[PDB]
RNA sequence: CGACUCUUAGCGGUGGAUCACUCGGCUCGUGCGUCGAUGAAGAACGCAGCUAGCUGCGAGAAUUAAUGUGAAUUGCAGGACACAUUGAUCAUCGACACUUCGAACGCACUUGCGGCCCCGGGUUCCUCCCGGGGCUACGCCUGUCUGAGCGUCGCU
RNA sequence: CCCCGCGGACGCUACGCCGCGACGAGUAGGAGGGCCGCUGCGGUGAGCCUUGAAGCCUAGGGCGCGGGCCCGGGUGGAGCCGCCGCAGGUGCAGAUCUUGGUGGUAGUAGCAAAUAUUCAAACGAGAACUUUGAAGGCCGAAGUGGAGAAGGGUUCCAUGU
RNA sequence: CGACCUGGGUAUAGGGGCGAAAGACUAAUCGAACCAUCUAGUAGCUGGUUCCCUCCGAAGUUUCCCUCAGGAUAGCUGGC
RNA sequence: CGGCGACGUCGGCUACCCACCCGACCCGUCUUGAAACACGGACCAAGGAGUCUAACACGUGCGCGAGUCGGGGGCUCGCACGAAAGCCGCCGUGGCGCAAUGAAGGUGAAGGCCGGCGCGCUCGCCGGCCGAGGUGGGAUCCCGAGGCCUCUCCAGUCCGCCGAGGGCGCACCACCGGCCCGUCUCGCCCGCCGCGCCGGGGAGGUGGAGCACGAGCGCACGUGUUAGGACCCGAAAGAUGG
RNA sequence: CGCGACCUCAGAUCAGACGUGGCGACCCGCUGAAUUUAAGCAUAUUAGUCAGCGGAGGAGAAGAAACUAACCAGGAUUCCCUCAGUAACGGCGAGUGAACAGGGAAGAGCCCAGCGCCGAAUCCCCGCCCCGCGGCGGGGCGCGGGACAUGUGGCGUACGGAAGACCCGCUCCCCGGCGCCGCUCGUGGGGGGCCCAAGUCCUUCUGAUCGAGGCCCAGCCCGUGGACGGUGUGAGGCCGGUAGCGGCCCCCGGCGCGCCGGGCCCGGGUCUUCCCGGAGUCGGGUUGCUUGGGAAUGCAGCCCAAAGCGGGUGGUAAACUCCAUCUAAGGCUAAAUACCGGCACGAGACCGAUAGUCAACAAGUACCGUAAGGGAAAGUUGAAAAGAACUUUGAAGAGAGAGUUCAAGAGGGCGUGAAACCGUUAAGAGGUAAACGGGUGGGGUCCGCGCAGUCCGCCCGGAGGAUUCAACCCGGCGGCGGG
């Protein structure tokens, strides 16, 4: 808010022997404003309590290792059909969830061939869902230029822009992302992992030298290696059903002993 | 009032600091502006090195940093004298010169004259009038080999 | 979408420009589509509405196939008065009902030197667009 | 049985909360970064066919010219406007114009009064009256002209 | 070595479900939970909506210990909400609180300083109050008279409402 | 009939004026005018401090303090 | 097991009005004590008060880990989003941590077992090993006599469970030693391109926010304290210029 | 005993110029508090801050060492990170508090006086002639004035410089135009003007729709354009726009070549001989302020008052000594940096009419005060005025009819239209003021598709239908297992 707001009144308190509250009052006469409370957060036309200031620390810094970790997690979750379906991305006729297309997509020029590619990749139903989800936002965002809202479509991840950006980008929901400049804000749109991602073959191949293997470090990040699991086998059902675990157990106590009515 | 164990704190906020607060919301804009100015300057001095004149090898002063070597302000007059470059001609071919720096030992002097000689060998001097080359360079090498060097000229390494 | 950093997408700014537009660009704002026959005859789609050309109302209460000549272009209220787009008021006199020019189609153009120049300029720009996009 | 009073509900008032709207703000950022004796900022008074304010303008006064545009302006009226022996409106704005105070400048002001030089009229050149035009502030630099000094000297 | 039957409830959002035992005061104060509530942002609901959004009203039907919520009817006329996260100028009975509105008081106090009015007529929808006439009174020339300064600034004068 | 009353014009301006003196008067303000700002001045003092349920639950005592309407300190409390 | 069931009745403890019995003083607040003859409150609507920054402390979550952190800069068509994100590594400069102690000059954290030698003179020249000592507790883990089995016994095949005792002992705690810096007391040696008013060493007390096989760094969140208008409203005053 | 020259002064409405005042967010020079904190308060703090005065510019100021250091040295200024809440200051209390080195942004250097040499080589003005105008310059002439030896210009400035020799290298400067490029540049350099894709298709909802369903050929059409706004609803295709190294037209500006008109004059190296510097200033004393600067950091007043192998600094006063480092008392200078005023833009996890600026509106307005100054309230008919013709009562306000509209139960302070409060109607009640908790009862309004009251699994019986039930054959697809 303005640092001057509510404080350009020259108002002073009336004292205490005048049967009014001791709030400052506007001076002078001849106008409605005269004798009215001023400067207070409780006063109409006064200053708000603790006025908002521009040095609010709007920005946060996150460790680079944390940010790389989040990118790796989002990429790993984008290859599991349960998580992408749970983000709601209509991957039902998609032939393969890590969906990789040939490099010639990068040189597309018209939007017609981008639409045709999505139709033939069976990713068009997600675009249709975005179309169905276009509606007006509720609240003051309409007054503040966020008038229309829609859901997120597939993310096209490319290696080189030979026209693919212009071929897409008129399809609602589509966001195009360079493989070398992966963004967590686009890979996990709402903070939830599992966005549908379509990879160009060049990007898919560069991915292994970009974040590295577990047995070789990344060649394009100079200190990064993939993070380690604290649980190699997360199949709790298999682990419990395993004979070695079952040999060590005592027998289950599955009989219920309810309260005995004391006769 | 102090409360149990703690650190005796002395905040320097007794002096109406809220009138003099420097926010940094123009930092990305400043980075863009400086980057654009750098690009424009590099375009302006078209084949000349973008970073600027070659700087000398200089040892950092105190006992904490004297094991380290950095780039200096300019080549000394003694260095230019024993390298054979006029002090008023060096600044036109892109050699920075510091008239107030002396040389206390011969090893630094010799390292910097070897630096000057290597730079002078690496230089491609265009003729003043392109049609008529007086003593600048051969057109065969200056037509192809002339490109704008990026980064510092012969960066100083430890 | 819009990429030019010097044209605004702010709703308040766009509305302010629209409602405080000077009349010489209110003329641009008050353009009408040509009929299909006119859009085939000239390679143009739209045309600023003019005092003495005849239109058909295509939306609202007065829509129909009836051709009516424009009798007024009231740029202050962003409306046009057409010949039979009218109603009786209380005392029995007839008053024109203004409608937006975007809700009419121009069937015949009031043709003069300036109109012909604008028509050929628009057609030439459209043709260079087609040959660029060939 | 009515009145009266209380509670609740329907309707009607009083009031303007709520909600929805927003040509307004606030905040951040960018690019420029330009006033004035050739008279600024500010003020006053005027100016429209009907006009008080706001806005615009200056006795050429809600505007002239020029250029771009290309048929309106509009609340009413009026009359334009072959749109080519050129054009409504609007925009732009480089030509022209720009009342009185104001640093404010002939002197002075809560009023008023000069002086000088030209021009026209009554005069019917001589200087009175009227009108028009141009000058008439302070400080200061360079130069010019006119000077002052029992200042320092030269010659007689 | 199950087989004339080929068959056999539910469960286990593991942050879930089940069992058993004891216990339950509370200011100042602390903590936890909130599928309590408000506003905005990122996701999501192939969400809702002119065949009717928000808001408001309601002797309507209910749910929850509660904060509150859902549904019916009316009015209204254009936008709104659920879930997962994020962010606050986020919840009022008080502050002789701020601004706005409204009561009782109350058809009450009051419209009581300087003697005083009355008759007839006219105009007019309408007359205690206007106008004319008649009468009775007052100011009583240090005036309730006739003119100015300061101040006001059109109040001056006609015509009309 | 007088140290008389009074108009207008002038002069004196705030820690200053003016006072036949009452701390009187100085634009309904005077034992220090009014206006704006420093200024959201400071307050150990008064008033207020906005949703629900569940669980736990005090102190008015010790020592030191220009300390006695306040603090620090130990105690008592809650949470992890 | 019985009765009753459409224009009159059936059920609906909630919700509207009314009646009766019992109970019931007006809230907020300061206070030992408020219904108070204590203060504020006529009524209704809307607004209205622990906030943000910085700095600490501890707790919690995350990443990396003797390291960690790019926050300032730079590179990537300059820019819908994007003022975002990504990258740098001879951009890690630097910060914090990894070393303490003394006013400072300065100094600065490894010991134990087994041998021959001086005199194994409370000990100096070596050797060999091992690599932060020991005592008492100590989760967990290891061994384990002896038992628990089938239709039965003379005789071994493979492992499961209980198990008195015994062992290695995490973290942590108490204690005893040891080491580093300061400072006292005592005392005898050693070193040399500077033989010195030089330098080094030992034993015994004692001062240190120390060592003794690191735990930190960055980010986020909570709480508490503090400087700021500082939860909100409130002086009498003081100053500057008019 | 006048005329001249100079010096020092004066006047002029003399010829031609220049300053003043405003804005003031940022910047430079001064001046300069108190509230406040210290739980009192005087030093301290607030704070070299507010207020006051002066002066600028698009930036300003600063700035090319009388520097930092003590090292194997760095090298103008300014800004960022860090140094560092540190060294230090401080009733050593509260509190205050830099710098160097290091890493970066940027980077650029120079000119006089003096000492000298060169016949004042120099400058201004006025005339006349030519080339020009776009901010008034070039060239030429003047027995034309003036300035200036009480010092103009050229060389030259601490990094040394000059002059002579000897040797070596000819190497090529800056201005204003004629025609034309690369068309200037992340693909126009800038300003302005006009233009450039695609549904108003079919059926329907509505007052109106931009709504809903559909549009065979893999799907209505365009999409480098699905930003936004308008339009009677909520629109990629109705309109303006949006995208585009899209188009056309006009104007402006610095970039190379041949020529044009003028200026345009020798550079380096070695040796020899010469020449070298800023004074009421430094420095010292004392006083006052200021700083982290502490036996005195800086500034200023007064007094004293220099030197030249000197002088300054070397963070503890002084003497001696060595060393290091710079060269004061003259001047200029871009960039990085600042910007709550101005011109023009863009944006937002902000506010949404008691909010957000005081001001969404004829707001610094109305109004108040003598003045300085103080300073509001106040948004919404409807898609369209279609803003209610006409009849009727009344003097009119105001009504009853009628009419417009989807709606006037939208009627000019007119979207919605809460509560408090009030009127009327309906029901109920009423001598312990109302109101309240618990428990019932009565009445009332509504709810229950209440009104002969649930379904469904198997079996039995009866009365009927129909493919076909099992098992085999063919084919397809899955689950499991396979040395
Ligand atoms: Mg406000
Ligand atoms: Mg809402
Ligand atoms: Mg650089
Ligand atoms: Mg009502
Ligand atoms: Mg004109
Ligand atoms: Mg007079
Ligand atoms: Mg004389
Ligand atoms: Mg109990
Ligand atoms: Mg309890
Ligand atoms: Mg609040
Ligand atoms: Mg209230
Ligand atoms: Mg309360
Ligand atoms: Mg009465
Ligand atoms: Mg009376
Ligand atoms: Mg009488
Ligand atoms: Mg009189
Ligand atoms: Mg007295
Ligand atoms: Mg106060
Ligand atoms: Mg004491
Ligand atoms: Mg008390
Ligand atoms: Mg109280
Ligand atoms: Mg008491
Ligand atoms: Mg009480
Ligand atoms: Mg009592
Ligand atoms: Mg009392
Ligand atoms: Mg009290
Ligand atoms: Mg009250
Ligand atoms: Mg009261
Ligand atoms: Mg409220
Ligand atoms: Mg970044
Ligand atoms: Mg380092
Ligand atoms: Mg132990
Ligand atoms: Mg010990
Ligand atoms: Mg603490
Ligand atoms: Mg306060
Ligand atoms: Mg005081
Ligand atoms: Mg003159
Ligand atoms: Mg000035
Ligand atoms: Mg104090
Ligand atoms: Mg105090
Ligand atoms: Mg005090
Ligand atoms: Mg100031
Ligand atoms: Mg400057
Ligand atoms: Mg300077
Ligand atoms: Mg120098
Ligand atoms: Mg530190
Ligand atoms: Mg200070
Ligand atoms: Mg000279
Ligand atoms: Mg179009
Ligand atoms: Mg629309
Ligand atoms: Mg649209
Ligand atoms: Mg365009
Ligand atoms: Mg010393
Ligand atoms: Mg307001
Ligand atoms: Mg409202
Ligand atoms: Mg009336
Ligand atoms: Mg309606
Ligand atoms: Mg209404
Ligand atoms: Mg009622």
């Amino acid at each position: 808010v303005s640092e001057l707001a509510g404080h350009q009144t020259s108002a002073e308190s009336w004292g205490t022997g005048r049967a009014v509250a001791r709030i400052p009052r506007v001076r002078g006469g001849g106008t409605h404003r005269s004798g009215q409370g001023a400067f207070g957060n409780m006063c109409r036309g006064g200053r708000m309590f603790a006025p908002t200031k521009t040095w609010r620390r709007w920005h946060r810094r996150v460790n680079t290792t944390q940010k790389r970790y989040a990118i790796c997690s989002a990429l790993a979750a984008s290859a599991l059909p349960a998580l992408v379906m749970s983000k709601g991305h209509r991957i039902e006729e998609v032939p393969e969830l890590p969906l990789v297309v040939e490099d010639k997509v990068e040189g597309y020029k018209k939007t017609k061939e981008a639409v045709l590619l999505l139709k033939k990749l069976k990713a068009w139903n997600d675009i249709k869902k975005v179309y169905a989800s276009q509606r007006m936002r509720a609240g003051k965002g309409k007054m503040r230029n966020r008038r229309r809202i829609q859901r997120r479509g597939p993310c096209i991840i490319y290696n080189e822009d030979n026209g693919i950006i212009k071929a897409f980008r008129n399809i609602p929901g589509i966001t195009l992302l360079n493989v070398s400049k992966l963004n967590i804000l686009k890979l996990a749109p709402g903070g939830h992992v599992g966005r549908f991602c379509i990879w160009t073959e060049s990007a898919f191949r560069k991915l292994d030298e970009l974040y590295g293997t577990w047995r070789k470090a990344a060649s394009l990040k100079s200190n990064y290696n993939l993070p380690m699991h604290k649980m190699i086998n997360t199949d709790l059902s298999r682990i419990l059903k395993s004979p070695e675990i079952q040999r060590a157990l005592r027998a289950p106590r599955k009989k219920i002993h309810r309260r005995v009515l004391k006769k | 009032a102090p409360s149990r164990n703690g650190m005796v704190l002395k905040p320097h906020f007794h002096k109406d600091w809220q009138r003099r607060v420097a926010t940094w919301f123009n930092q990305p804009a400043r980075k863009i502006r400086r980057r654009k100015a750098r690009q424009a300057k590099a375009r302006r001095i078209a084949p000349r090195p973008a970073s600027g004149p070659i700087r000398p090898i200089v040892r950092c002063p105190t006992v904490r940093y004297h094991t380290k070597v950095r780039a200096g302000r300019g080549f000394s007059l003694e260095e230019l004298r024993v390298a054979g470059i006029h002090k008023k001609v060096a600044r036109t071919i892109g050699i920075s010169v510091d008239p107030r720096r002396r040389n206390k030992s011969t090893e630094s002097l010799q390292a910097n004259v070897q630096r000057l000689k290597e730079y002078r060998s690496k230089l491609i001097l265009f003729p003043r009038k392109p049609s008529a080359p007086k003593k600048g360079d051969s057109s065969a090498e200056e037509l192809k080999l002339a490109t704008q060097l990026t980064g510092p000229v012969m960066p100083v390494r430890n | 979408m819009k990429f030019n950093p010097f044209v605004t997408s702010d709703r308040s700014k766009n509305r302010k420009r629209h409602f405080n537009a000077p009349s010489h660009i209110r003329r641009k704002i008050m353009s009408s589509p040509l009929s299909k026959e006119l859009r085939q005859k000239y390679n143009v789609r739209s045309m600023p509405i003019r005092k003495d050309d005849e239109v058909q109302v295509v939306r609202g209460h007065y829509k129909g196939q009836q051709i009516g000549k424009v009798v007024q272009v009231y740029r202050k209220k962003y409306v046009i008065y057409i010949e039979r787009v009218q109603r009786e008021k209380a005392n029995g006199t007839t008053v024109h009902v203004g409608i937006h020019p975007s809700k009419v189609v121009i069937t015949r153009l009031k043709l003069d030197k300036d109109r012909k120049k604008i028509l050929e300029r628009k057609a030439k720009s459209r043709q260079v667009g087609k040959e660029k996009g060939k």
Side-chain angles (χ1 to χ4, degrees):
Chain A
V1 292
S2 195
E3 81 283 342
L4 301 170
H7 267 257
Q8 46 195 355
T9 315
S10 84
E12 83 165 6
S13 185
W14 270 8
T16 199
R18 307 191 57 177
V20 301
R22 297 188 299 205
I23 191 76
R25 316 262 179 185
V26 190
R27 309 191 68 113
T31 177
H32 291 143
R33 190 74 181 122
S34 294
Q36 285 187 347
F39 296 158
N41 57 301
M42 79 276 286
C43 297
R44 162 203 201 265
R47 174 222 64 239
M48 72 177 264
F49 155 75
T52 52
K53 290 183 151 38
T54 43
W55 53 89
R56 183 184 287 271
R57 205 169 87 87
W58 312 84
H59 302 74
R60 303 280 185 276
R61 57 185 301 272
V62 182
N63 294 1
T64 307
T65 307
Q66 301 251 348
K67 303 189 278 191
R68 276 151 182 183
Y69 201 104
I71 287 296
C72 295
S73 293
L75 286 191
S78 83
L80 289 178
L83 308 188
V84 180
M85 280 281 286
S86 293
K87 275 299 292 287
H89 274 285
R90 322 300 293 137
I91 46 149
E92 291 102 19
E93 293 90 10
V94 167
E96 197 152 354
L97 188 61
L99 191 52
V100 184
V101 286
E102 46 175 348
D103 277 349
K104 88 180 297 289
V105 170
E106 282 176 354
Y108 275 5
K109 296 292 183 311
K110 312 276 301 192
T111 313
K112 288 279 169 48
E113 41 201 5
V115 177
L116 192 58
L117 171 76
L118 288 171
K119 281 192 206 286
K120 275 169 184 289
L121 289 179
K122 305 301 184 171
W124 186 245
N125 269 338
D126 208 28
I127 302 306
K128 282 166 56 53
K129 195 185 209 166
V130 181
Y131 275 120
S133 79
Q134 298 184 319
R135 78 278 190 194
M136 287 302 173
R137 187 202 286 282
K140 298 303 212 300
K142 306 203 295 315
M143 299 181 178
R144 296 166 206 194
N145 296 326
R146 316 173 287 264
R147 174 159 288 256
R148 283 159 199 76
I149 44 174
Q150 72 187 8
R151 82 172 308 265
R152 289 286 166 173
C155 200
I156 308 299
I157 296 145
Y158 62 93
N159 175 45
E160 274 190 325
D161 178 39
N162 303 324
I164 175 163
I165 282 177
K166 297 196 177 164
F168 296 81
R169 102 186 175 174
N170 212 41
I171 321 293
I174 285 285
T175 66
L176 297 103
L177 205 56
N178 199 357
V179 57
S180 308
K181 299 180 186 301
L182 283 196
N183 193 350
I184 193 55
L185 301 180
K186 314 302 167 59
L187 290 177
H192 319 311
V193 296
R195 177 162 203 190
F196 185 30
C197 296
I198 303 185
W199 298 81
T200 305
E201 192 197 338
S202 289
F204 207 64
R205 292 196 178 280
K206 194 175 290 298
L207 207 59
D208 211 4
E209 55 171 327
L210 197 56
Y211 294 94
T213 308
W214 276 290
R215 54 178 296 163
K216 69 181 178 75
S219 86
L220 300 154
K221 282 198 204 307
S222 90
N223 210 357
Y224 194 62
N225 220 319
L226 276 192
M228 289 285 178
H229 293 266
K230 74 180 65 178
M231 186 190 212
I232 295 308
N233 185 23
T234 72
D235 211 311
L236 215 61
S237 280
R238 292 293 309 287
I239 295 163
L240 296 190
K241 298 304 289 180
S242 83
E244 46 263 9
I245 294 294
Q246 293 287 337
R247 260 193 307 270
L249 306 186
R250 61 155 177 79
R253 304 202 255 267
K254 288 194 274 189
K255 165 166 264 294
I256 308 303
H257 305 291
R258 301 201 162 79
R259 194 181 92 107
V260 164
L261 168 78
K262 182 177 174 68
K263 290 188 170 181
Chain B
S3 191
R4 285 202 199 75
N5 204 2
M7 190 185 288
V8 171
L9 296 166
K10 295 220 195 280
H12 285 55
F13 295 111
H14 296 99
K15 218 201 268 192
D16 206 8
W17 59 276
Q18 281 178 118
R19 273 169 50 201
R20 302 168 303 279
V21 172
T23 47
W24 280 58
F25 305 123
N26 66 331
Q27 152 185 43
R30 185 205 312 284
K31 293 176 76 69
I32 291 170
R33 182 185 309 125
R34 287 169 167 173
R35 177 179 161 75
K36 278 200 301 185
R38 258 183 313 263
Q39 290 164 352
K41 182 195 56 210
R43 264 181 258 121
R44 213 184 65 242
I45 47 164
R48 301 176 190 84
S51 287
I54 171 168
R55 310 283 171 182
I57 284 158
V58 145
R59 201 157 279 281
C60 306
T62 51
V63 77
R64 166 167 173 181
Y65 298 102
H66 67 83
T67 53
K68 185 171 72 178
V69 166
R70 60 161 172 83
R73 165 160 192 107
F75 290 87
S76 84
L77 296 180
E78 175 70 14
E79 274 150 27
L80 284 164
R81 262 198 292 280
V82 298
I85 306 156
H86 201 251
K87 75 168 173 194
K88 274 152 193 159
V89 175
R91 263 188 215 106
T92 77
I93 58 173
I95 301 180
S96 65
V97 49
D98 194 0
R100 75 176 66 92
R101 173 160 80 78
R102 79 274 187 188
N103 279 110
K104 288 183 56 187
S105 73
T106 83
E107 287 97 7
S108 71
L109 180 65
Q110 280 325 293
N112 266 315
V113 307
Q114 300 313 320
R115 191 166 168 82
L116 275 180
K117 287 178 154 40
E118 190 173 2
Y119 171 84
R120 194 69 180 81
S121 88
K122 282 213 236 167
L123 196 72
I124 295 162
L125 192 58
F126 282 76
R128 194 83 213 282
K129 190 175 167 71
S131 72
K134 279 87 158 175
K135 286 283 298 304
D137 258 333
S138 70
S139 184
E141 76 172 352
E142 88 174 0
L143 265 170
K144 40 175 204 281
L145 263 54
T147 194
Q148 189 164 17
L149 180 88
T150 53
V153 190
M154 299 162 63
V156 165
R157 293 285 183 256
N158 265 286
Chain C
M1 67 173 291
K2 183 217 84 180
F3 303 114
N4 186 8
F6 300 110
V7 58
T8 176
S9 80
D10 186 25
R11 160 171 191 97
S12 292
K13 271 161 181 165
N14 272 105
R15 276 166 59 78
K16 195 176 163 72
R17 266 68 162 279
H18 178 261
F19 287 114
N20 297 263
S23 74
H24 90 282
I25 69 166
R26 287 190 175 238
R27 178 184 158 279
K28 306 281 182 60
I29 295 172
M30 293 173 76
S31 294
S32 304
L34 298 203
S35 75
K36 322 296 298 305
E37 289 81 20
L38 283 191
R39 192 201 284 174
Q40 178 262 318
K41 175 182 204 312
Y42 319 102
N43 203 10
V44 310
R45 174 184 200 88
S46 306
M47 209 57 214
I49 201 67
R50 176 72 156 75
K51 164 69 160 288
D52 271 320
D53 51 17
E54 57 195 14
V55 300
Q56 304 169 190
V57 192
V58 302
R59 291 292 184 268
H61 181 253
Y62 296 91
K63 61 180 176 176
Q65 305 303 120
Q66 47 263 40
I67 313 284
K69 170 199 106 172
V70 172
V71 295
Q72 189 163 353
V73 177
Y74 205 89
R75 286 189 192 155
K76 187 166 219 168
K77 268 151 40 198
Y78 275 132
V79 288
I80 53 163
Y81 296 149
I82 323 171
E83 276 183 348
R84 268 95 67 199
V85 185
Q86 55 196 20
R87 82 189 318 283
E88 310 304 305
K89 55 181 315 179
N91 58 6
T93 73
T94 314
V95 287
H96 282 117
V97 182
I99 67 173
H100 207 262
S102 69
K103 302 294 167 275
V104 309
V105 293
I106 302 165
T107 57
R108 179 169 299 173
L109 294 150
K110 170 65 187 293
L111 273 187
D112 48 54
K113 172 188 66 180
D114 285 306
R115 296 306 287 295
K116 291 184 270 213
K117 279 178 78 76
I118 302 162
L119 283 172
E120 60 93 13
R121 196 171 309 167
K122 284 165 169 268
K124 172 197 178 177
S125 292
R126 186 165 279 213
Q127 199 66 20
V128 73
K130 296 303 188 286
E131 72 92 19
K132 155 188 166 64
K134 69 183 182 318

